[PDB]
Design a protein around this nucleic acid. Structure first.
Lengths: 130, 124, 125, 306, 93
RNA sequence: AAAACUUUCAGCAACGGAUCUCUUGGCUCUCGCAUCGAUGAAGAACGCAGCGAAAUGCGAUACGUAAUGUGAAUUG
RNA sequence: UCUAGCGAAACCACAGCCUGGGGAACGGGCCAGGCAA
RNA sequence: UUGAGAAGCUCAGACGAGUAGGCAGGCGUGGAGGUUUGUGACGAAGCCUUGGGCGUGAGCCUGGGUCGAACAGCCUCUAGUGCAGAUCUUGGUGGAAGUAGC
RNA sequence: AGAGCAUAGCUGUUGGGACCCGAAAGAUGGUGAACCAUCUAGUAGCUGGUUC
RNA sequence: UUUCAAUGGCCCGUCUUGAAACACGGACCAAGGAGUCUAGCAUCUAUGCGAGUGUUUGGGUGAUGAAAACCCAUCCGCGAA
RNA sequence: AGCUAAAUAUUGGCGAGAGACCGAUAGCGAACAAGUAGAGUGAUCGAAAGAUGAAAAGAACUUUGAAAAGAGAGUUAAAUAGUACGUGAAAUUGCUGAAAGGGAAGCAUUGGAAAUCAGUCUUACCUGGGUGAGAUCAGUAGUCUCUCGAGACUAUGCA
């Protein structure tokens, strides 16, 4: 399967895919939007806050706050799948960030939604040698 | 006699920008109350015979040559005596095999090839 | 050119005949040539394939490699050749199929019926 | 399966059969888990046996691959070759010259600069006139060069690199791919003039050793550690990958040693595929073929030559 | 005179062809090796898989640190720092 | 004024199933021939396979037997 | 009432500050205007 | 002086709105007989693309990317031959809308 | 000190389902006032559309 | 090509109305989609023959599609009066 | 009061040969489970639905997950052919990059800017000599096909 991100080869990344998931498309898009760019462990804690009603996902494009749990539950497995796929590669866990996420419309058979997630690393090497 | 054109921009169909079911191919607007057909200000132009180019320059590329479509290597040979006015256009489906035969023959013949660097690759 | 009105020249009708043919009509559609020295020995050109016939593949990825015909798979017009196999995912061997008009028959399985067939078509052993 | 021609039937037949295939695959996985958690030795033996296959493991057997034990015959042959002056006590310093094809453009002139960036002490002379490659190599022999690199560019895209070893060394002809400039690399860095540190990996076969040997001859023998610039040449399924990086070590928990370096790509970044190795200066027609790849034979993806 | 006129032009125009054929042969003009759409695609796909199975960053990582472990440098290189060299000393002993 | 939001354009991924290629189908014309049933027809239902989902085939002699051939395959 | 979960149909050229005059409505687009964040 | 596709080439002058309507020349699609000793796995047809051109225009030729088995220029023959509408037929898809709500 | 006849085309006209779409039908024969099937391409000065 | 700057330009088709005003039809995209086939008549032009004219009802024939092509007997039609 | 062949009809039945015919919204209502599902008390009505690849080689195995599935990995010429399978258009939606964004947008002219392509070419000609050549040239010798000489050559010398 070919993803939508120029990264996510074996460089520093692991993937995960969801196909025809039985969740409302609009909810998944808003859930995906807020968690993009956050740390992987930070995103896990935030998702727990949503379950515990400590934090609410903003609704920007599809409008304010809400506490969906089904869409977050779908994302929990994908993120768990994401780190499980990271381990198989053997990456550096403590620096995982959610580099990419995308929710796409599915066949109209309930409105399902494909979900993809890409975890990555942030690095900087000092040049020195001045 | 230089290659000078009375207009560069193409003639687009009226309202062809708004719709997508409407094609950009120029169609004469026959609408009875069509003000754009009526040649008002701020409207678009319309093809007229007044827009024709010089008859000694029609079909002429900006460098002065008229494109001539050569299918095989037989066709590139008959441009032996019009190499100063015609340029051997290579057909789009001519394979890379005969495409080199056409370009090497045309180079020695003295004629100009327009798409001589397609599907091929040089090696030194 | 065909001249008989008993024969047809139809892509639709001839393909209907080819893939609508039963096994006793498919046994002639699956014929094989004979090796040049054996072809002239019996003075016959081509004979229908048969189990336990020693053949050599002439075309395809398996060109040249010889063998016998373990079983003739009539319903898809294929010949199953021993040791001419393919490595599946699970390490087993899914033997590829070769069409009967590609291989060449080197050593026939001499049955009583085959001998009569040879001498029936103006041939001899 | 495929026997029944109706479209909607064969979908229902597959989906029913697919669900059944997943169901019994579930129960055999579960009972395997139940018995493996009961006896950890069963898990140990399964892991030590059920190693997934890979192209490298399923590679076809060829006899040219050298063993880990260094063979004396190889060293006897390679101690007096063309590049031996760079490997003997002479320690020749190699100077490089980079040229282009006849009347090329400015695309190469902004990629050959990146090439020159990774190659300190390497001149460049844009090809002018009716001079051919077999004449450049003769001229560079008396000028004081060692190897000669040409970046062929056509249709305003560079595609082939041919390099010869002066004065009569073998000539190699690679076809570049995915050549990305330093700008088109995320988190790129600015490189200095420090001498890069070569690293050559995965060149097991004999022919690959020679191609690796020539590339080693292409670099200055004395690296500058203080600049800690690294140039990587890695061969995997014949696709030689050239990359540049800057490495600074950090404390990494995952690596059992405890230390692991962060990397920042410097540019350039491109592939090569060894199209042909020639003996003598590169002549397209009248050269001697050390190796010319048959394109139909490479289709056996488990077979390699480098 | 029209008919003799056209023959002289053709003789003129054919000679220039023969001349140009000669000079081009003299010069060592480049060959034109064509491009195949099947080999280009297959090599494009086989490469992408190799990058995935090359593991560039990992391979350069582990072998470079083993080069540091073996110590191809002098007593202590200028690239390494004392904070991590202490773990180098502990690991190597 | 940036973000958010709104807008256009490009890359990429979904969505959709047009286009193109064909094709054991349809339609059209010509041609040859004469053949159902109280000796139970056409039709219907119930059965029957080493296992059939439809589908054909078959009738407790059931996806047919006898006989004449062909001569080694059926095939998930 | 809120929070989840499940979720339409109608409608749809395109829009949407007015002020006046704009002769045929003109305001929903034109010109003078202000507004316009 | 080569300028006889005499259906050619050449010279001169004036002229140019347009509904209903009349006349003329062309462009394009499927297939048909002839033809290009035509093109095609070294890539046909198709498709997308801010690549390059040609024509007043209908349209055309070509580069790149996909693509994988057919196709075309010319002279004639032929017709189920050209779409923005028909509260058009069929399929698809949005806003409305996470709304009415359950 | 006859100028037609025949074929092909073009435009025109008259019929034929007659450029396309749209008016309650009615009749025959059936099914359990209702409903179904055909005759039917029943009927229009009218309506909407009629393609480089 | 996107964008900006200055100048500009009332939604298209139909119908209505001198004209508009209008009232309609239009959520978007793809594909399908409407002077055709035939007998009669008259006209113009092209062709063959010309006081003639028209083989194809049919018969003869056609070995390589033989439903084609090729050939003509007795009438007959329309002209000639 | 009666019979009677052949010439003639034929949208059915048993077969057959073709076509300037349609090419999956077409051609039958049906290229397939087609009068089939399904609708209706009933008579009747009645669809949608073709294409992986040469070969199934249909994805072993490892791993995460309750599974479904995902990630590694494999097959293949190609997985931009993974059974939601030929090509994969438009509408339409999501992500990213870009510029723009005071109640529209929209397009047209003229440019500018950013971004990007068009195409580059002294090179050949003429003249001078030397050097080796060849021939359509020999104060030259043969064969072949044509119609003496016009070709294609085979020797031999290079004036």
């Amino acid at each position: 399967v070919r993803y939508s991100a120029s990264p996510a080869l074996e460089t520093k990344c692991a993937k995960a895919r969801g196909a025809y998931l039985r969740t409302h498309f609009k909810n998944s898009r808003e859930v995906a939007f807020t968690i993009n760019g956050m740390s992987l462990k930070k995103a896990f804690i935030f998702l727990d806050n949503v379950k515990e009603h400590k934090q609410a996902v903003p609704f920007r494009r599809f409008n304010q706050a809400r506490w969906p749990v089904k869409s977050v539950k779908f994302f929990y497995d994908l993120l768990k799948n994401a780190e499980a796929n990271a381990e198989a590669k053997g990456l550096d866990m403590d620096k995982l960030i959610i580099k990419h996420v995308q929710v796409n419309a599915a066949p109209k058979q309930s409105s399902p939604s494909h979900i993809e997630i890409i975890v990555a690393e942030e690095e900087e090497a000092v040049p020195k040698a001045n | 006699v230089n290659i000078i054109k009375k207009r560069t921009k193409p003639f687009k169909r009226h309202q062809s920008d708004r719709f997508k079911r409407v094609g950009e191919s120029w169609r004469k607007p026959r609408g009875i109350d069509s003000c754009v057909r009526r040649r008002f200000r701020g409207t678009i132009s319309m093809p007229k015979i007044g827009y024709g180019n010089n008859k000694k320059t029609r079909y002429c590329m900006p460098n002065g040559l008229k494109a001539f479509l050569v299918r095989n290597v037989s066709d590139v040979e008959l441009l032996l005596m019009h190499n100063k006015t015609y340029a051997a256009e290579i057909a789009g489906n001519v394979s890379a095999r005969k495409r080199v035969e056409i370009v090497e023959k045309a180079r020695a013949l003295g004629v100009k090839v327009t798409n001589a660097g397609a599907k091929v690759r040089s090696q030194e | 050119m065909k001249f008989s009105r008993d024969v047809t020249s139809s892509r639709r009708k001839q393909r209907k005949a080819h893939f609508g043919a039963p096994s006793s009509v498919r046994r002639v559609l699956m014929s094989a040539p004979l090796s040049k020295e054996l072809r002239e020995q019996y003075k016959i050109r081509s004979l229908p394939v048969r189990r336990d016939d020693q053949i050599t593949v002439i075309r395809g990825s398996n060109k040249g490699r010889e063998g016998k015909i373990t079983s003739v798979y009539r319903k898809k017009f294929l010949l199953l050749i021993e040791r001419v196999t393919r490595e599946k995912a699970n390490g087993a061997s899914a033997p590829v199929g070769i069409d009967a008009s590609k291989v060449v028959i080197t050593k026939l399985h001499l049955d009583k019926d085959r001998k009569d067939l040879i001498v029936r078509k103006g041939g001899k052993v | 399966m495929g026997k029944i021609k109706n479209k909607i039937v064969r979908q229902q037949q597959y989906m029913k059969a697919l669900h059944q295939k997943n169901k019994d695959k579930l129960e055999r996985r579960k009972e395997r888990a139940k018995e493996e958690e009961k006896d950890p030795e069963k898990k140990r033996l399964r892991l030590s046996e059920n190693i997934p296959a890979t192209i490298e493991s399923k590679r076809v057997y060829d006899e040219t691959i050298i063993e880990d034990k260094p063979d004396e015959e190889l060293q006897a042959e390679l101690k007096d070759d063309e590049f031996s002056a760079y490997f003997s006590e002479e320690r020749k310093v190699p100077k490089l010259l980079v040229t282009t094809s006849k009347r090329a453009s400015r695309k190469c002139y902004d990629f050959a600069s990146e090439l020159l960036d990774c190659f300190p002490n390497a001149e460049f002379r844009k090809r002018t006139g009716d001079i051919e490659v077999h004449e450049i190599a003769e001229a560079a022999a008396k000028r004081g060069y060692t190897d000669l690199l040409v970046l062929n560019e056509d249709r305003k895209k560079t595609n082939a690199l041919t390099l010869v070893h002066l004065p009569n060394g073998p000539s190699f002809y690679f076809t570049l791919s995915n050549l990305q400039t330093a700008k088109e690399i995320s988190n790129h860095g600015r490189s200095t003039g420090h001498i890069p540190e070569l690293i050559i990996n995965n060149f097991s076969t004999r022919l690959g050793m020679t191609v690796a040997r020539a590339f080693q001859s292409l670099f200055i023998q004395t690296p500058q550690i203080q600049g800690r610039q690294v140039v990587t040449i890695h061969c995997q399924r014949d696709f030689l990958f050239f990359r540049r990086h800057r490495y600074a070590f950090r404390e990494k928990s995952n690596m059992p040693d405890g230390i692991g370096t962060g990397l920042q790509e410097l540019g350039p970044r491109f592939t090569m595929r060894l199209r042909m190795v020639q003996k003598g200066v590169w002549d397209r027609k009248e050269g001697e073929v050390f190796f010319e790849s048959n394109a139909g034979e490479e289709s056996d993806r488990r077979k390699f030559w480098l | 005179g029209r008919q003799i006129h056209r023959c002289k032009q053709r003789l003129t125009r054919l000679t220039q062809y023969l001349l140009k054929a000669r000079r081009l042969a003299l010069k060592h003009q480049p060959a034109l090796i064509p491009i195949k759409p099947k080999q280009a695609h297959r090599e494009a796909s086989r490469e992408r898989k190799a990058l995935i199975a090359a593991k560039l960053e990992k391979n350069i990582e582990k072998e470079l640190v083993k080069r540091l472990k073996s110590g191809v440098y002098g007593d202590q290189p200028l690239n390494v720092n004392e904070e991590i060299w202490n773990k180098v000393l502990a690991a190597r002993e």
